[PDB]
Amino acid sequence: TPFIRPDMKAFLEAIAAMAGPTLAEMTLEEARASYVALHGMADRPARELAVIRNLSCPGPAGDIPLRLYDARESREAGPVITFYHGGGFVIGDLDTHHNLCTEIAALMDLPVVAVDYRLAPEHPFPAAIEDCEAATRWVASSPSELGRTASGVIPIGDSAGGNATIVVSQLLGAKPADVPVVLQVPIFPLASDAVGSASLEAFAEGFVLTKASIEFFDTAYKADRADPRGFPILGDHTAAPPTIVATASLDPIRDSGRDYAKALVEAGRDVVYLEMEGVTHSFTNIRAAVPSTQGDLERIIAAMKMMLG
Amino acid sequence: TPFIRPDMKAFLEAIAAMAGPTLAEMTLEEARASYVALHGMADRPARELAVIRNLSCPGPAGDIPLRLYDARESREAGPVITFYHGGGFVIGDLDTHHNLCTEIAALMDLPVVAVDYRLAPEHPFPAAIEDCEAATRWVASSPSELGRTASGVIPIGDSAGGNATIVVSQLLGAKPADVPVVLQVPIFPLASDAVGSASLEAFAEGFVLTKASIEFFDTAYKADRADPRGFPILGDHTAAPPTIVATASLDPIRDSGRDYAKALVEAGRDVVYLEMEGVTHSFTNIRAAVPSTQGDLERIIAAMKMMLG
Amino acid sequence: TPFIRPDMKAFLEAIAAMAGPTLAEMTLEEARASYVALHGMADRPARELAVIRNLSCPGPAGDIPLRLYDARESREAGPVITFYHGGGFVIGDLDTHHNLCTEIAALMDLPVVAVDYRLAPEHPFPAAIEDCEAATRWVASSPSELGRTASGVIPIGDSAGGNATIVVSQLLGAKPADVPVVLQVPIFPLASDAVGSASLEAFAEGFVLTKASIEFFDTAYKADRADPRGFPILGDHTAAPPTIVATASLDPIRDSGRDYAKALVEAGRDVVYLEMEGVTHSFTNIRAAVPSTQGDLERIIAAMKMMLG
Amino acid sequence: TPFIRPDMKAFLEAIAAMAGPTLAEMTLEEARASYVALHGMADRPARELAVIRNLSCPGPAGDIPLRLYDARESREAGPVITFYHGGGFVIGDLDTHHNLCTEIAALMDLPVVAVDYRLAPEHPFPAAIEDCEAATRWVASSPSELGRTASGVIPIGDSAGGNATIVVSQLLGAKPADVPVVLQVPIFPLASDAVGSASLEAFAEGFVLTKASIEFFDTAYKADRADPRGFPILGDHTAAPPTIVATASLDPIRDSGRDYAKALVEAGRDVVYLEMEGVTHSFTNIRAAVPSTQGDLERIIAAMKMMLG
Ligand SMILES: CCCCCC(=O)Oc1ccc([N+](=O)[O-])cc1
Ligand SMILES: CCCCCC(=O)Oc1ccc([N+](=O)[O-])cc1
Ligand SMILES: CCCCCC(=O)Oc1ccc([N+](=O)[O-])cc1
Ligand SMILES: CCCCCC(=O)Oc1ccc([N+](=O)[O-])cc1
Ligand SMILES: CCCCCC(=O)O
């Protein structure tokens, strides 16, 4: 039996007791609401910050809603974190990952801009990617509405947002924004197709993210298996920016993260690979229900400060 | 300050630390999802039963979904428990109270039929009552689809479901079903209007059920203050069936349950009044997070067995 | 016309046909002898028990005679029932309620200690109460002479004894004996002044206990209307022990018992309220003349077992 | 035309202009003195330290010479760095890597114990490994003669010493010393056989370490190709300690270090992979001739501090 932390196991047993409908059995609005409720009850509360401000920027389909987080009311030029939430490209929003964003802003002492990108099935692949790229380019242009100057950008995101992290870094690598990507932080990302992976079979049920949910998200999003914007393991890694890959040992898509970090080493790129032991997918947003995951996030923070130099 | 059990106080501290939005500040589906998560994560797992079966019966608006619970695959004629869930007539469903239902069925060794009645704001007062009454009459008719002959019915429900319990017993008292109500069990019910009561002021915040939530529910359901189907304290108590009223000492609507039991005594009716000390509203569905509440439920069960003979 | 059971009505008709004199018309010795004769006639025969033993304990005015009833010569530690007979504090003794005591001991499988407390007018208020309190404390101390160990006491009594039951529970509540009152069972008690009550007017004549007798007892006992030891509705109910209140629907002091049960609910205390339908005051001691009153006693017994756990 | 830093390229071109003999064309003593003279000229001078002290410990073939470096005469318990020098297992000693050792001790503020292990061809494989393992176990036991307490050990070494670093970590993993390996730092290690690698062909000549020298060292050391103590890529990686792998982009054995870091990710182990751009093998010891390599060492140091927490 795989190792599970005691506080992690208690959370999994409560989810098993709840025994709700699957995502596919709910309406879309119900599925999205259940994710709000899960993170609402499981995550630590928001940090207080000097600046929490809603903005928007132009996108290919229309305006893209954004939210700026900053512990400082005024700050000098520096890197700006551009955050993309998880949720399979189907669920999640600015509120499901709000508390985590306030934590990243507080602990990094850098500004964070979260992207409220368009969701599937209403907006299938590559809608989410289009919006994350556009928003990241916009932040990288130091617009006056943002109120602080970017000397570089730091894409970061969990799961689907970790997929978006890598894709955005590849798109900006090929066609630079006004400043470079100085660091990327894909957190338990989907980089290679998880179908057929050993982690997917081993952790298919009972570890928060299920094989059934992965298939539900896949059916809604409709990413093409040969498209590097859907599966960025297929992209060109030879100029990948400095990278921190964080995975979970109990994640059904753990091996997708392993694959990506291996590909970066194969291409000679600098990478920190951290595989959190005894916790699941989504550990960044369950920091109250599973208190030991706060320490896992803090290790990512420490790696980020190190890699920023 | 009022007495609070240590495990109860730890649960309240967790809720306070979460510092979530009010039900009114969420979308309606987010409010419903937050209740699914509250019970889902805080209650004990379901009992294993011989029979857990979805069914439906005709109602005035269309079909009424039902769920049958029975520890026995087949059984002789006997009383049948008809259960109405809490949630202000706005939230809750068959799943939010599913584990509690399996526990009632296991500990009573009687069949339980839970009612998936229509909810406000989509279906305001008296839609919930219409469906609860219709389902209870249908069970009382011993339909072949149920496979359980009813010698009598036992209305039971928590909070809004405790309101429904009393209204149904009054409606069936006035126009009998095929068999009588042999016992009713309103658990922390709303019987009289809570506005103005001492308990509402004393426990308006910080005790799971809040004054703000009570107001949210009241606005959606739109019960007429003069209608005994809304506030059954106004009804005729002179032929009330044998009753167990269970309240919580920390409940903002505690005094409404006190009022009902006093009205039963005033009318010469047999009643067991149990006020659980140092726990809150909703204690029937938080039996894992607050382990001492399992004993509270078991006291209700013991009183039911006694009052059934 | 109030509902009267057929067997109860026939007994009332026989009493009327015999047309005996009132308590004021008889001599004190004759009144006491007629009470002996009524129960000796009307009640079911005594149960055979291993132990029926006279005892005594020190009191504030000399020794208090007691009678111990137990189905077992030797038993484990457990609650001990402490019984106070009815009779207005003027008539009755250890023999008038002897068969009832044997029935309680047989059906509960607990020891019962009946108190031969001082009677008015020879010994007016508060004599009876002082003796009932002293005897209950003595039993609660597990004295060697009792022959069994008390883990708690259960005060119980009919009418004036129901008054004594509540007063004793309040006095031991304020100044504890060696073990707690774990349950009290006031049976058709006098808790509030019956003067002015609707039940006193409705059942003033022809229902075994008469208005004339109530006034007779009151003149003899001379209880202070403002003293909670005379009228324990005036006492502090906030810490009342678990309670079973039993009344009779045709009792002139029925509303007194209703008042007390209501006051317990108002104070948030656990209480079973049972109002026996279609029978009179004294139903616990007329179980042969009115055979259905045995079932009434058995309902009280069932409630006692439930409330003891 | 692979990228080469300007100061790096100047160093390589001066070496080319000298046109010195190969390792095969020199005597053993000439080769070893040649390496002493290269580092003596090319590396930065020694840091001044409170403690630079020769020690020794028992080994499998007699006493193993050690040298202790510490910026502090007296310190709290903490990890102790155990260092193994490069030189193909044929050349190098405590003096060729002395200045680098003082730098590591100064910048980490941790004690460093360098190992004077037995050299080939006089002592072929596995003599060097045996000595490195024995010395690391000795340090890990916190012997009185060490003068400070080890709470853990940190194996570190360049090239052949990077090979020894990994092998020691595997041996202590299978058979623990008194304290764990808390971090390992293999610097341009030989982990997998370089023969057949793309890096070996691309950088066979002109980049400090030549293919000819690799062959010369290999024939002297005579490591068994199937032995994980000779080629630790063959070892069990499933419990590898936290790791920092540092390589150089112009290193003929660069791909061996890539292979090892990929194998750790594949096994789910935490690893920092740093590939220094535009510098060669041996960059840790040419920090005066190529001043930009001081920054490369400082990046390794920063990663070490981060991974130690
Ligand atoms: C309801 C369980 C958590 C589902 C949401 C979640 O865990 O965030 C994800 C985002 C993307 C992917 N994915 O790309 O398969 C999976 C998960
Ligand atoms: C979010 C916690 C409260 C959830 C709802 C609940 O606890 O069940 C109730 C049902 C009905 C009423 N009511 O009628 O006011 C109150 C509460
Ligand atoms: C002969 C019928 C009356 C016998 C006395 C009786 O039935 O028991 C009572 C005890 C106490 C009170 N009281 O306190 O008013 C009334 C009645
Ligand atoms: C004469 C300068 C190059 C030789 C010294 C050197 O570069 O240190 C090494 C140690 C070990 C290995 N090896 O294990 O192949 C290669 C190189
Ligand atoms: C309203 C204050 C709550 C406790 C007071 C009571 O038990 O009636």
UniProtKB/TrEMBL annotation, chains A, B, C, D:
Domain Alpha/beta hydrolase fold-3: 82-284
GO molecular function: hydrolase activity
InterPro entries in the record: AB_hydrolase_3, AB_hydrolase_fold, GDXG_lipolytic_enzyme
Tree of life domain: Bacteria
Signal peptide: none
Pfam families, A to Z: Abhydrolase_3 (PF07859)
Keyword vocabulary terms for this entry: Hydrolase
The name this protein goes by in its record: Lipase
